[PDB]
């Protein structure tokens, strides 16, 4: 949960370092790349947060078909 | 419930007689319609040329065959009637016989009507085709004969259903 | 798809072993008061048992609806926020503060009650709300109650 | 005017530009949508 | 479907036989065809419209006078029926479909029907009104043929306007205002001022494509001959004449075409 | 008592099937005569589509025969389930045959005209008509399956 | 009880409506194919795809009818009124969806075939339209299957 | 006892009516596209928007039908006539809204496909009109969702 | 006992009829808008006024449906027939009013598209006609709300 | 007993019929004014009278329906079937009269738009015709009010 | 008893039918008068006589409705099934007569507008048809009043 929350954030920083190294050829190009990386990280983390908050404490238990 | 009971309490003899009469009526109507359809084209062709009267008469004969089959079916249904005793007026056998008679009559009438309409349309086309060319009359007559089998099939089905009559 | 824990229309082994375990029910049916007791939540994806269960439809439908609402709120917020950046970049007049601020505030606040209620129900586990009573609370326009 | 198109960004920029254009240096929603559209179209077809 | 056998079957058979039999000699053939058509007397309205087709031209010719007495020599009952100069035009406004509309559209009488060009304009307007009236009686496959004929007439008029009648005030606006896919997309021919431009406009309709071809023949003629000759060439489609359908107009058109071919034969 | 519906199913199955069969045969026949006016040889071979339409009546006739044989009252107690099943089985067969014949009549009528124009496309018309005629066979399969449920 | 009198009726209606829709599609498809192939016999083979696309609805309806028929078995369990009603609802829904999809596919295919010889791009456009139409038939079949499956519990 | 019949009928009616509306819209759009794309290849893909815009309504209807079908659970709660009436009302509302949206979308898409050969500046307006029309489908889905949510609270 | 079987039906009918009227109006409005945009693309954006106003009827219908759904509260009070019948009648009235307003707005927009295409000087008159037409929808919504308000027996 | 059903049905019928009549009248008036909006925009502004008259008729119908609804107070006095029948009859009469008046006024305005466009001197005649038409709606409203007042006389 | 369930309904229907007939007649007459005024503004004022004469139907219907409403009074005396049936029959007869008279007067006035516009000599003479229609309406009203006079005949 909260440990995984830092894991997603930490994953972006390494990706941020790779993006900076790759796009250092262009400053304005690097600025655009950083926005894309941040947006992708935020979207993925939000999707995971929704998927985890839904099943964290379910209100309805799962019944299995026969 | 009460309405359902009244519906189930209807007399089956009336329904059987209605179906028997309706078979003959529908067969006659379909045969007459087909005869008129063929006759319009036959008269037009004769006005164009009186050479193909013998060829045209085949369509009229085929149309009248439907009426003949319907009359035969009606005679069979009339033979299938019984005395309708008061005690068994609502017996399961009487109800089954009446339902079978009604179904056979409806099937015979509908099949006769369909066959008559198809034969009339085919003959109307065939007379004009023969007027256009007498060489195509054989194929048109064969097609009309093949299409006439609908009435025969319906009559066979009605005859098969007629064996279900068991009125005491 | 990895998030959804569904692979080629089939579940598989999540990062955990089993999120939910049948409470007792060594021989009892799944449909029971005990039902299934969850040891811990599977972090990689949805619970594998939930996908193939009879209760798959309601829970998955509620989760998908909540995710769609949250994603729409986020997209609308991003689009509204882009207005201030566009106004500053083009050096637009006071119309941004005059109109863009209320435009980005009204819809944000209107959806904020629903988004916060969804989050709180997810966070606080307020089962007295579920998917339906959230709309029920949002339904009433009048005060009190 | 048209913003400079990269080798990979060209397709997404063309897809987004099908709604119109802007000023010489005005707002360019293509920058966000280059990843936003993949960030949303994935959900409707999520199956690994 | 059963309505054909209910009524009109004998007349349809007679018409089909007469058409199948078909193939001062030209005048004699025209008189024989007119007599055959007259002796045939729902389908009454169709026959009335078919007669009114040529009756519009007959009335336009009779509208002269100016040697007006010579119109009796061409009193063919097929098109020159007696039942089908503003004072006389008002009297002639009855018993014709296009006459009531032409009374208002051509209220200038000879002013809007000058024998040089404006008489052709009045004739085109009357033809457009008659075509609209015929298309109003929808319900059969003949609607496509009527639309094709009206489109051919309109396109021929537009081509003639763009060729040389543009100097006669038959401009792009007049290509549809006075010159009678065409009922919806005739605007493409307003700028077809050249034979190549005419072919390009015809390219908008793939069926009409390659119909113009080199445009040396057919399109070379003015008035309504340019695209009407295309319809004459394609009249083999009308030669199909599928049964159980209104084919009286098709038979009349075939007889008229045969008469025209016989006239064009003349002394070999 | 209920057996009235079961008996009605067999009659309806034949009646509705023949209703569509005649309509298909009429439209197919009319086009054949039109082609036979000019193309003498093409019309003779084109009669197959009319023959194909007439087959649908045979399929309905057989389905009716099975329903009639299974309505033996003195043999087994024809409960309401048997009557309901037989009526349902006939209804599908009759309705499907009516639709299947109607498509064949519409397709066949155009096919005669198409063959008279370009003889090359005759194979294509047969393929489309054969595919359309499979629906009547599909209805026949459903009729057999439904009628087979008369066990109890 | 009286539940079979509705369940079997719904099962029959599913196949009946599916066949009606398939025939309505196939008639228009064949008319358009003949109209196109009258002038361009080469594209006749390519124009036959919508016919098969429409005919697939017949197979879908037959499968739904087979499922519905197999779903009723008094010898296995007492088919209460709820089971028969749900089966009839599934049959009616599947049949109506199939009929609508067939009519739409027939209209679209007739239009495309009429426009097929005008431009070769029609070979792709009409195929895409037919696929989009058959998507509705597939969705209806899925809904019918789900309803038929849910009909099996009946408390 | 008879309430599940009403509920299943309502779900089936929702699915069937949504399918019919989507089919009508798709057929109209297909006719328009076949007419338009003969002249130019632009209508082959640049104007295929209504083809999927109409199927979106069918997808929404299928989702609503699946939700309604999942709503019924006799083994979990003995549904009274209230549940059946609510399910039938929700299904009818969803199906009617789907049919209306399908018809409107089909008409608008046919008009847009016809106008495609005209000035392309109208593409934005056509898309806006199509979206405004399709908003009815979302409104109907919302109404159906609200009805389904209120359905299960029967006493 | 049978009151909900009428109230829910009335709410659904209200929503359905409002949607049908909105679609009927929007079809003609969109046809006219497309025709005008083909003729004159300049005013295409400003010609969507009837198209936009059409959705107001659907919004009002959805609001009425939501109010009717909130009206049925069996737990709060045993729903007697006097409340269910009133709710059903209110829904029917709102739906019929919405359908009539939608048809009128569709006719008005179909006329006004051509009217503005010939001369944009009639835009004010077209807007006034549309407002007068929508007054009927507003009156119908008000009447439906008033009728639904009387659910207290 | 069941009187509230009759009363609510009558009120709903009154509102629906009044709305339908007003809509028909407004549509006819707009169709008529479409030509005047281009032929002579100066006179087009004065041409909005029939629309206002139709709106007035609709308002009168709505007012009558509101009065009828306000007349139903079950907690104050028990509503016998006599009062419900009287209220339903009053509503039906008011709605029918309003619909007829609206249709007549719409036709009159549609004719009068062209009549005034051809000649401005026909405005007086158009106004007189509109007033005569609105007199019927006024009489219908008066009759409905009288019937609503008499509806409470039962015991 | 359930007397107003028919008596009040008939009283309402009388006014409804009279209003509908008067509206149809007035609409036809107004269209004709607008056409005539467009032809000649001089005759517009003089040609309003049929329009005014068509208004007598509304007055007669209102009077009949008022009389019927006053004829129902349970407080004064209980009305049996016969007492309400007779009033309903009188109202129906009056309404049907008013509708027929309105339609006839509308057709006659529509013809007479053109007749007066063409030949002013026959303009005054044509009023005989309108007089006959008004006499028919008056006879119908008298018959209705005679039928309604039997309200107190019951015992």
């Amino acid at each position: 949960f909260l440990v995984t929350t830092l894991v997603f954030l930490v994953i972006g920083i390494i990706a941020s370092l790779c993006t900076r190294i790759c796009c250092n050829r262009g400053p304005s190009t690097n600025l655009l790349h950083l926005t894309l990386v941040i947006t992708a990280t935020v979207s993925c983390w939000m999707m995971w947060a929704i998927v985890y908050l839904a099943q964290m404490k379910p209100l309805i238990v799962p019944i299995l078909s026969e | 419930s009460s309405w359902s009971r009244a519906l189930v309490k209807i007399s089956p003899y009336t329904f059987s007689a209605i179906g028997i009469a309706v078979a003959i009526g529908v067969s006659v109507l379909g045969a007459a319609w087909g005869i008129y359809i063929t006759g319009s084209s036959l008269i037009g062709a004769a006005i164009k040329a009186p050479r193909i009267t013998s060829k045209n008469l085949i369509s009229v004969i085929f149309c009248e065959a439907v009426a003949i089959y319907g009359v035969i079916v009606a005679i069979i249904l009339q033979t299938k009637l019984e005395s309708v005793p008061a005690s068994q007026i609502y017996a399961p056998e009487s109800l089954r016989a009446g339902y079978a008679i009604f179904a056979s009559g409806i099937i015979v009438g509908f099949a006769n009507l369909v066959c008559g309409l198809c034969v009339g349309i085919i003959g109307s086309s065939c007379a004009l085709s023969d007027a256009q060319n007498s060489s195509l009359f054989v194929k048109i007559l064969v097609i009309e004969i093949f299409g006439s089998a609908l009435g025969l099939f319906g009559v066979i089905v009605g005859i098969i259903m007629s064996a279900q009559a068991s009125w005491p | 798809g990895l998030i959804y824990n569904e692979f080629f229309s089939v579940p598989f082994e999540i990062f955990s072993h089993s999120a939910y375990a049948c409470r007792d029910l060594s021989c009892s049916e799944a449909t029971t008061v005990g039902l299934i007791k969850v040891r811990d939540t599977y972090p990689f994806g949805v619970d594998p048992v939930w996908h193939g269960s009879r209760s798959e439809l309601p829970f998955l439908n509620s989760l998908k609806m909540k995710m769609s609402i949250l994603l729409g709120v986020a997209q609308m917020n991003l689009g509204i926020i882009l207005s201030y950046f566009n106004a500053t970049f083009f050096r637009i007049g006071v119309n941004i503060w005059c109109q863009f601020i209320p435009q980005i505030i009204f819809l944000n606040s209107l959806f904020g009650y629903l988004s916060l209620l969804i989050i709180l129900k997810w966070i606080t586990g307020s089962q007295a709300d579920l998917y339906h009573v959230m709309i029920y609370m949002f339904l009433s326009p009048t005060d009190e109650l | 005017t048209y913003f400079r198109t990269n080798k990979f960004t060209s397709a997404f920029q063309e897809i987004v530009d099908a709604y119109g254009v802007a000023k010489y240096r005005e707002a360019n929603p293509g920058v966000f949508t280059i990843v936003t559209f993949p960030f949303l179209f994935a959900v409707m077809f999520g199956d690994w | 479907a059963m309505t054909f056998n209910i009524h009109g079957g004998y007349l349809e058979a007679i018409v089909r036989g007469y058409r199948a039999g078909l193939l001062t000699i030209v005048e004699k053939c025209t008189l024989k065809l007119v007599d055959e058509y007259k002796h045939m007397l729902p389908l009454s309205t169709f026959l009335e419209y078919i007669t009114y087709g040529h009756m519009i031209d007959n009335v336009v010719l009779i509208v002269t006078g100016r040697d007006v007495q010579e119109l009796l020599e061409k009193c063919h009952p097929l098109g020159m029926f007696d039942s089908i100069m503003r004072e006389l035009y008002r009297l002639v406004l009855v018993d014709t479909p296009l006459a009531p509309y032409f009374s208002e559209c051509i209220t200038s009488e000879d002013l809007d029907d000058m024998n040089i060009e404006i008489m052709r304009n009045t004739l085109y307007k009357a033809y457009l009104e008659d075509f609209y009236k015929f298309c109003q009686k929808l319900g059969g496959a003949t609607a496509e043929i009527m639309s094709d004929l009206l489109a051919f007439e309109a396109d021929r008029r537009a081509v003639n306007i763009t060729i040389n009648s543009i100097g006669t005030e038959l401009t792009r606006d007049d290509r549809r205002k006075l010159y009678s896919l065409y009922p919806y997309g005739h605007e493409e021919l307003a700028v077809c001022e050249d034979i190549d431009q005419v072919r390009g406009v015809m390219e908008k309709y793939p069926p009409y494509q390659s119909i113009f071809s080199k445009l040396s023949y057919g399109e070379s003629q003015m008035l309504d001959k340019a695209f009407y000759e295309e319809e004459v060439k394609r009249l083999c489609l009308a030669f199909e004449q599928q049964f159980h359908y209104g084919v009286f107009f098709a038979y009349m058109r075939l007889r008229e075409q045969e008469i025209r071919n016989l006239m064009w034969i003349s002394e070999c | 008592t209920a057996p009235f519906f079961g008996f009605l199913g067999a009659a309806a199955a034949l009646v509705f099937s023949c209703m569509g069969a005649a309509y298909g045969t009429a439209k197919s026949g009319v086009g054949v005569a039109s082609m036979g006016v000019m193309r003498p040889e093409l019309v003779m071979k084109s009669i197959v589509p009319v023959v194909m339409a007439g087959v649908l009546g045979i399929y309905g006739l057989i389905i009716a025969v099975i329903i009639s044989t299974g309505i033996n009252p003195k043999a087994k107690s024809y409960y309401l389930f048997d009557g309901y099943a037989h009526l349902s089985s006939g209804l599908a067969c009759g309705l499907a045959g009516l639709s299947a014949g109607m498509a064949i009549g519409i397709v066949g009528d155009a096919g005669v005209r198409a063959n008279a124009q370009q003889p090359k496309l005759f194979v294509g018309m047969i393929l489309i008509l054969i595919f359309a005629e499979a629906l009547a066979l599909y209805g026949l399969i459903v009729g057999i399956i439904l009628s087979s449920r008369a066990g109890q």
Side-chain angles (χ1 to χ4, degrees), chain A residues 12 15 26-27 33 40 45 48-49 52 54 58 62, chain B residues 6 12 17 19 21 23 25 30-32 34 39 44-46 49-50 65 67 70 74 85-86 91-92 97-98 100 103 105 109 111 116 120 123 127 131 147 149 151 154 158 163 165 168, chain C residues 1 11 19 21 30 34 43 45 48 52 58 72 74 79 87 93 97 102 112 125 128 141, chain D residues 11 18 20 22 27 29-30 33 38 42 46, chain E residues 1 8-9 13 17 20-21 42 53 64-65 77 79 97 99-100 126 139-143 151 154 158 167 183 185 190 200 206-207 218 226 238 246 250, chain F residues 2-3 6 9-13 20-22 24 26 29 31 33 36 40 49 53-54 57 60 64 70 73 75 83 85 90 92 94 96-97 100-101 103 105 108 110-111 114 116 119 124 132 134 136 139 143 150-151:
Chain A
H33 274 285
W45 181 65
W48 164 89
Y52 190 81
Chain C
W97 195 15
Chain D
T33 61
Chain E
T64 63
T142 179

